[PDB]
Amino acid sequence: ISTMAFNLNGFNFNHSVIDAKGNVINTWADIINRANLGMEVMHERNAHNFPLDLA
Amino acid sequence: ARRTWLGDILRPLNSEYGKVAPGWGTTPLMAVFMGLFLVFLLIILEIYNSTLILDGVNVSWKALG
């Protein structure tokens, strides 16, 4: 918690697997990411005016 | 202890406490029926599971007509 305080975050394997053409091949990490997205977009739903939640 | 009419009549049915047949007795026969009962439960489970499918056995509500 103390080091995620300075935004050194958990491993990101979002789109780490792609196929011979370049298609993304989802893994369980990308499914985690869909859940993380739904938390992100909803939290403090009136509080963000700009596109990145930088803190 | 108190004797009662009904007690005197049932007495023989609670009078062989501790009596055993020697050695292994019927254990091999018990084992056989255990084995048959397991396969029997296997079949029943797998029919319900639709892992075992049988002619004329439609495991659905539509087996009421």
């Binding site: 196929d19 011979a20 053409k21 298609n23 091949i25 | 639709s50």
Partner: protein
């Protein structure tokens, strides 16, 4: 104290031990290696190769949607790459 098996620290500091295992350990390593480098692992287990998750102009998952035809469904999808 002991159940009469030969102690491990006696075995792995022993010369006979390493005489056998300097062969058996690399050979196994190379066997597993060849299992993959030959492509055999792919075919045994059915794992897609990087070029065979999708067909060229496809972006649908070839998802099994039937229980008892499921084996047939997979085979259908696999033909749609050949």
């Amino acid at each position: 104290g002991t159940t009469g098996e030969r102690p491990f620290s006696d075995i792995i500091t022993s010369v006979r031990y390493w005489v056998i295992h300097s062969i058996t350990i690399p050979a196994l390593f190379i066997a597993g290696w060849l299992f993959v480098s030959t492509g055999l692992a792919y075919d045994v287990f059915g794992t897609p190769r990087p070029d065979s998750y999708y067909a060229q102009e496809q972006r649908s998952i070839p998802l099994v949607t039937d229980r008892f035809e499921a084996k047939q469904q997979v085979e259908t999808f696999l033909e749609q790459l050949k």
